[PDB]
Amino acid sequence: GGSTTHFQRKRRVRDNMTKKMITQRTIGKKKQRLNKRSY
Amino acid sequence: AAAAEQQQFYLLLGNLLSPDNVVRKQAEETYENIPGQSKITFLLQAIRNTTAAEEARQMAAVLLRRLLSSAFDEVYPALPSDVQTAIKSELLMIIQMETQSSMRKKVCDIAAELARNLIDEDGNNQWPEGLKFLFDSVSSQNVGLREAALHIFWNFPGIFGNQQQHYLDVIKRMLVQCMQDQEHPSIRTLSARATAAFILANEHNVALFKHFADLLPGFLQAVNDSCYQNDDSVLKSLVEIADTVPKYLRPHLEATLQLSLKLCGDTSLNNMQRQLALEVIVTLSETAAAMLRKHTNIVAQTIPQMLAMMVDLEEDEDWANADELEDDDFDSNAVAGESALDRMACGLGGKLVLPMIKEHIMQMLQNPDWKYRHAGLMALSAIGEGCHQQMEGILNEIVNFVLLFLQDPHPRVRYAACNAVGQMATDFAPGFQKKFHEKVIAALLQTMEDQGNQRVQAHAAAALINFTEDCPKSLLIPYLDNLVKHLHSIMVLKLQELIQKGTKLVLEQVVTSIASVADTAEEKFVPYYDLFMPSLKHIVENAVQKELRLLRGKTIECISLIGLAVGKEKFMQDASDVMQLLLKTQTDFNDMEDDDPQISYMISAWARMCKILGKEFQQYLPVVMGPLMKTASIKPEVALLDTQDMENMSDDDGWEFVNLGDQQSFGIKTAGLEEKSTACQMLVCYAKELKEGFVEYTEQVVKLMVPLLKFYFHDGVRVAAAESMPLLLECARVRGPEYLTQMWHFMCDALIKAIGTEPDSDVLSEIMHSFAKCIEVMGDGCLNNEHFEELGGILKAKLEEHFKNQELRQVKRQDEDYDEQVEESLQDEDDNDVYILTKVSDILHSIFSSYKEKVLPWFEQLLPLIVNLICPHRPWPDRQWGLCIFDDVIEHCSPASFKYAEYFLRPMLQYVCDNSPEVRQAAAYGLGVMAQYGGDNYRPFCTEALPLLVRVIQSADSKTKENVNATENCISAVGKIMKFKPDCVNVEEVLPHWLSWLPLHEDKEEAVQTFNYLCDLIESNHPIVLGPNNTNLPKIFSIIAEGEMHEAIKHEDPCAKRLANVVRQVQTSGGLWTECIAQLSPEQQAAIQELLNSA
């Protein structure tokens, strides 16, 4: 449909250097969806 | 002789009380083979006999409940009805005459489980005796029978088949009456819990929610009364209600909020009760923010409570000497308050939270207590993400105030200031760095280099890491020298201290900071390479003992990042030694668990070294591929327990439990999931980097990643498994078409099934993108008939879901609680839906390009929905993608597409004049592709399409950054119609106007087409382009020079050469070239020279 109009991943991101001592990773709750909604 | 059997049963129960392994095994072996009916009769006899010890009775009751809930299907049917009636009557009799509370509750659990397992069919109780007993139980005098009835009701809230028809009023009256007595508090708590469970079970029932609203004051009074008796059982029910069904609280929400505030402000209660009371409001903010935003007073009163929680810091003298990053607690008041502040700021939004917390923070940052300043800095750190847009215009004074606290008399306040700076750099990126680098870098470096406290230094280094990670490379080069100095001297000092003492806290942060600086500086780190590599290797060779494993992993990661930054040329002088170090480490450490910190740092190091060492790395592939595949296919431990059993496993070694429906607990061990995600991503990177060299390991990776598509425990694993699909096909392409077909037969069914099943929108979009890419890899026969049918069904379901979600969102609007933030959430959902539609169009384009005219009968079933997408009243995102799909149909499935032209041709002709630039672009591309791959059938429509296209092109506001792309597409369409259909265009009149619109510069694949047309006209003869003699040549030369700039790729594309030769075709007589080039800008002359040199 135009080639350039296809395969665009606009809404994606990436990063390196895992750890980052100072972070908001505490996230005890929130992001609670239970994607394993089976059985 | 039943007496001997009972004696043996009591003996084995007594053995089970204090088992040890021997009688553990022997009792399990003896018990697992007992006949089911004999088991039921024996357990009932044991429960009835009130002579043995309470432990035996309780243990037997637990056995009966577990046996029922596990294997009711094999110990009840196909048995005499007399036995069933006898056991039911026995259970009711034991319930009636039981006196001890615990045993009565256990038998209530047993009876509720039986009634749950004896419903069957569409839902109708087969045990009317149980319901009758419950009704005559709750309306009685003795409190034991009422407790039994309420516990039966709570355990299975739903022993009914016609509750709405007749029994709703009776249930409401029973619960109201039970939450009214003043002599037995235990009845009130049980009734409140029963009401909460009944409301939770009957979810998605607005009528029930409005009919049961009169019970809320009693529930709130019950939880208030219970929380003062060291019993938070009802508070947990309130938290569950607020989490799952907040609308139930809407009648009395204010009252509820006030109660929580009281329960959060009362110091008499322990920490857990106050934290749960706060969690009520926090969960309400997270789940139902629109309902809570109306009560601003409650938020304005709850913010001081959380701020006063964070002042609850214990003066610890064993702080500055701590050498490990000990876990915070997640139980102390300060951490819970900070987390609650973060969650509420994220949920309610900054527009409401910021005005009431800003003044509190600014007032607390002045209190001479070292605890109020710490709390203020931590609140500033916490509210950073939630109040993002509102704090973006106030960042200057906040930063200037925070940076003044790095020079503070108290070390903990400086630690908090470093935390605030680092968290603000993380949240406000990359705008924080550009406007504040000059002061932030200087302050952090000054704090790091001159300090007597070794916990402020490490946290300042971590803040520097957070700052430099997102800092663009352009504005860091001036600071590279002043970073390498003050990062190398401190490394030297800390490495000296590491040999004598055992200090590692600040050395790890310094190493990570150097790694981050090198990573973000890339090739500019070469002059400083020799400053760091000899020392870093010295850390890797040493630090071989335990409790330095994190240091070794960080040093190895830093070495890998520095090597990747400096490139292969400079790295290939110590690369052999680093390879030996990594090999020795890999062969040494490979004896520990999967939570060893050197199991996520070694894999990424190996992948980085693969990136550095390209194809030479193939030698080391067998060594790395072992442990990577071992840790990429770990199966997490999962257990399906009962809720009454879940409590009993309170060891909590890492078990994460979720309360499944109807008294069940589902637990998974989240130990190694992140390592699995890292290993899968590194497998994807390995395949991408190696291509043909990965063919030996392609089969194992395919057989591992195909099941991982249905791995719902981690989204990253599923995303990596989806991404690896086309890369592995490209790797296996080398072995021939048969190997490709085998791998595709492995992957195709799994991908198709995962497309129509994935809950997550992002993972689903990635899966659809990967499937489209895989189809693009293998064309003309990659799908069977079964795959075609399944794909058609799934795509029709997806389009129907997309159409229905718009109506569902419209119903979501016009609600009792709708504001701006709800609209923003709905817009985000709309964006996700449009992305899924984009991926659907991608899959359709791949299928069309692969199959051509043979796939139209399959597209017949999807045609009505695509026609629906192009409806004039639809939003522009739907119309654009419908037109794109029809353009694909035209390009690849012609000249048979005339059968479908009545559906799209008139909308295509109409939409060229649309207000939306994207719909205009799609319609223009469709009109252009009509002439090129349409044949003689679409001949008369080009005559109609041309005037509309020229009208769109010649209109004003056509070259602005918005409508420019649509105008470029229209120009390309007119050029294609002129070239491939010159009979009905009158080219001699359009071409002089067409030359004015040239060239194109932001559309690349249309630019090559239009320049191919320009060359074809030039290479052929006079018309238009070259008029009298060669006087027109200068304007075409100017057009070419203007279009030179990164438009025709200088990699010797077929078009560019045809252009360049033309420039060299005129470069024969100096007379014409001089006059053609005399009226060009110096940039144009340089462009012409570069174009001539490039091809």
A6, A9, A17 member nearest B469 (Cβ) = A17
Give the chain A residue nearest B415 (alpha carbons): A22
Nearest by Cα to B885 from B863, B907, B909, B906: B863
Render B749-789 in DSSP notation, one character per residue: HHHHHHHTT---HHHHHHHHHHHHHHHHHS-SS---HHHHH
Are B962 and B999 in contact by the 8 Å Cβ rule? The answer is no
| Spatial distance between the Cα atoms of B953 and B969, rounded to a whole number of angstroms | 10
B283, B466, B887 member nearest A22 (Cβ) = B466
Instruction: State the CB neighbour count (10 A cutoff) for residue B359.
Output: 10
Give the chain A residue nearest B286 (alpha carbons): A30
Task: Please list every residue in chain B whose beta carbon sits closer than 8 Å to the beta carbon of residue A24.
Answer: 342, 385, 423, 426-427
Task: Please list every residue in chain A whose beta carbon sits closer than 8 Å to the beta carbon of residue B554.
Answer: 19
Residue B419 forms contact with A (CB below 8 Å):
yes
Residue B712 forms contact with A (CB below 8 Å):
yes
| CA within 13 Å, CB half, B1009 | 22
A6, A17, A30 member nearest B845 (Cβ) = A6
- The distance in angstroms from the start CA to the end CA of chain B is 104
Q: How far apart, in Å, are the Cα atoms of B102 and each of B13, B98, B136, B794? A: 18, 10, 21, 52
Are B1060 and B1087 in contact by the 8 Å Cβ rule? The answer is no
Radius of gyration of chain A (CA): 18
State yes or no: cis peptide before B999, omega within 30 of 0: yes
Strand order in B664-669's β-sheet?
Answer: B638-641, B664-669, B655-660
Measured in whole angstroms, the distance separating CA B992 from the mean position of its chain's CA atoms is 54
Please list, residue by residue across B654-689, b when 16 or more beta carbons sit within 10 angstroms of its beta carbon and e when fewer do: ebebeebeebbbbbbeebbbebbbbbbbbbbbbbbb
* Strand locations in B92-137 (E): none
B343, B762, B884 member nearest A1 (Cβ) = B884
| Spatial distance between the Cα atoms of B179 and B182, rounded to a whole number of angstroms | 9
| Spatial distance between the Cα atoms of B385 and B72, rounded to a whole number of angstroms | 51
| CA within 13 Å, CB half, B1049 | 10
Residue B1042, helix vs strand vs coil: helix
| Spatial distance between the Cα atoms of B134 and B892, rounded to a whole number of angstroms | 70
Q: Residue B1035 carries which side chain, given as an amino acid letter?
A: K
Are B844 and B888 in contact by the 8 Å Cβ rule? The answer is yes
B843, with CB counted inside 10 A (0-12, 13-18, 19+), is buried
Nearest-5° Cα angle at B863, B858 to B868: 160
Task: Please list every residue in chain B whose beta carbon sits closer than 8 Å to the beta carbon of residue A30.
Answer: 286, 343, 346
Which residue has tokens 């379901």? B797
Task: Please list every residue in chain A whose beta carbon sits closer than 8 Å to the beta carbon of residue B462.
Answer: 20-22
* Strand locations in B576-684 (E): 638-641, 655-660, 664-669
Give the chain A residue nearest B885 (alpha carbons): A1
| CA within 13 Å, CB half, B883 | 33
For residue B681, the surrounding DSSP H or E stretch is: helix B673-690
SS3 of B178-227: the string is: HCCCCCCHHHHHHHHHHHHHHHHHCCCCHHHHHHCHHHHHHHHHHHHHHH
Which residue has tokens 């407790």? B147
Task: Decide yes or no: CATH 2.40.110.10 for domain B400-471.
Answer: no
Q: Which residues contact B962 (CB under 8 A, 6 or more apart)?
A: B917
Residue A13 forms contact with B (CB below 8 Å):
no
Q: How far apart, in Å, are the Cα atoms of B1 and each of B7, B8, B906? A: 11, 12, 92
Are B687 and B731 in contact by the 8 Å Cβ rule? The answer is yes
CB contact under 8 A, A30 and B343: yes
Q: How far apart, in Å, are the Cα atoms of B728 and each of B624, B705, B722, B731, B812? A: 18, 10, 11, 5, 43
Task: Please list every residue in chain A whose beta carbon sits closer than 8 Å to the beta carbon of residue B604.
Answer: 18
Indicate the DSSP class of residue B637: P
Are B239 and B285 in contact by the 8 Å Cβ rule? The answer is no
Indicate the DSSP class of residue B407: S
Task: Please list every residue in chain B whose beta carbon sits closer than 8 Å to the beta carbon of residue A9.
Answer: 769
Q: B383: which 2 tokens?
A: 């509210």
* Distance of residue B313 Cα from the nearest chain A Cα, in angstroms: 18
- The distance in angstroms from the start CA to the end CA of chain A is 41
B561, B713, B885 member nearest A36 (Cβ) = B713
Are B491 and B534 in contact by the 8 Å Cβ rule? The answer is no
CB contact under 8 A, A7 and B515: no
Residues across chain A = 39
| Spatial distance between the Cα atoms of B942 and B909, rounded to a whole number of angstroms | 10
Render B901-939 in DSSP notation, one character per residue: HHHHHHHHHHHTT-SSHHHHHHHHHHHHHHHHTSTTTTH
Which residue has tokens 């609007």? B813
What are phi and psi for residue B650, nearest 5 degrees?
A: -70, 10
* Distance of residue B48 Cα from the nearest chain A Cα, in angstroms: 35
B656 forms bridges with which residues in the sheet? Answer: B668
* Strand locations in B1008-1095 (E): none
Nearest by Cα to B583 from B535, B611, B617, B614: B617
Residue A14 forms contact with B (CB below 8 Å):
no
| Spatial distance between the Cα atoms of B288 and B520, rounded to a whole number of angstroms | 41
Measured in whole angstroms, the distance separating CA B1089 from the mean position of its chain's CA atoms is 50
Residues across chain B = 1095
Render B958-1021 in DSSP notation, one character per residue: -SSTTTHHHHHHHHHHHHHHHHH-GGGTTHHHHHHHHHHH----S-HHHHHHHHHHHHHHHHH-
| Spatial distance between the Cα atoms of B769 and B842, rounded to a whole number of angstroms | 7
Nearest-5° Cα angle at B976, B972 to B982: 140
| Spatial distance between the Cα atoms of B461 and B34, rounded to a whole number of angstroms | 65
B211 forms bridges with which residues in the sheet? Answer: none
Render B258-292 in DSSP notation, one character per residue: HHHHHHHH-SSS-HHHHHHHHHHHHHHHHH-HHHH
CB contact under 8 A, B343 and A2: no
| Spatial distance between the Cα atoms of B950 and B929, rounded to a whole number of angstroms | 17
B660 forms bridges with which residues in the sheet? Answer: B664
Q: Residue B160 carries which side chain, given as an amino acid letter?
A: F
Nearest by Cα to B661 from B643, B637, B639: B643
A9, A17, A35 member nearest B712 (Cβ) = A35
B658 forms bridges with which residues in the sheet? Answer: B666
Please list, residue by residue across B240-278, b when 16 or more beta carbons sit within 10 angstroms of its beta carbon and e when fewer do: bbbbebbbbbbbbbeebbbbbbebbbeeebeeebbbbbb
| CA within 13 Å, CB half, B591 | 4
Indicate the DSSP class of residue B663: T
Measured in whole angstroms, the distance separating CA B1015 from the mean position of its chain's CA atoms is 50
Q: B944: which 2 tokens?
A: 């109609």
Are B1043 and B1007 in contact by the 8 Å Cβ rule? The answer is yes
Scanning B471-600, the segments in alpha helix (DSSP H) are 480-484, 488-500, 505-521, 526-541, 549-571, 575-589
Residue B318, helix vs strand vs coil: coil
CB contact under 8 A, B666 and A30: no
Are B701 and B677 in contact by the 8 Å Cβ rule? The answer is no
Q: Which residues contact B886 (CB under 8 A, 6 or more apart)?
A: B866, B870, B900, B903, B904, B908, B926
For residue A7, the surrounding DSSP H or E stretch is: none
The answer for B 460-479 residues in CB contact with A (under 8 A) is 462-463, 465-466, 469
Render B857-897 in DSSP notation, one character per residue: HHHHHHHHHHHHHT-TTS-HHHHHHHHHHHHHHHHHS-SGG
CB pairs under 8 A between A and B: 107
Nearest-5° Cα angle at B544, B539 to B546: 120
Considering Cα of B500, then B505, then B506, then B508, what sign does the dihedral take?
Answer: positive
Are B342 and B307 in contact by the 8 Å Cβ rule? The answer is no
| Spatial distance between the Cα atoms of B925 and B973, rounded to a whole number of angstroms | 6
Indicate the DSSP class of residue B620: G
* Distance of residue B617 Cα from the nearest chain A Cα, in angstroms: 21
Task: Please list every residue in chain A whose beta carbon sits closer than 8 Å to the beta carbon of residue B426.
Answer: 20, 22-24
Task: Please list every residue in chain B whose beta carbon sits closer than 8 Å to the beta carbon of residue A34.
Answer: 658
B658, B891, B1004 member nearest A34 (Cβ) = B658
| Spatial distance between the Cα atoms of A19 and B325, rounded to a whole number of angstroms | 12
Q: B1009: which 2 tokens?
A: 């087409």
Q: B543: which 2 tokens?
A: 């630090």
| Spatial distance between the Cα atoms of A21 and B719, rounded to a whole number of angstroms | 26
Which residue has tokens 């043995």? B52
What are phi and psi for residue B99, nearest 5 degrees?
A: -105, -45
Q: B991: which 2 tokens?
A: 């071409």
| Spatial distance between the Cα atoms of B683 and B702, rounded to a whole number of angstroms | 11
Task: Please list every residue in chain A whose beta carbon sits closer than 8 Å to the beta carbon of residue B1003.
Answer: 4
Indicate the DSSP class of residue B166: I
Measured in whole angstroms, the distance separating CA B936 from the mean position of its chain's CA atoms is 50
| Spatial distance between the Cα atoms of B880 and B498, rounded to a whole number of angstroms | 63
Nearest by Cα to B590 from B623, B635, B627, B620: B627
Q: How far apart, in Å, are the Cα atoms of B642 and each of A35, B66, B85, B194, B639? A: 20, 8, 26, 19, 10
Are B743 and B698 in contact by the 8 Å Cβ rule? The answer is yes
Residue B640, helix vs strand vs coil: strand
Are B137 and B148 in contact by the 8 Å Cβ rule? The answer is yes
Are B687 and B705 in contact by the 8 Å Cβ rule? The answer is no
Q: Which residues contact B1047 (CB under 8 A, 6 or more apart)?
A: B999, B1000, B1001, B1004, B1007
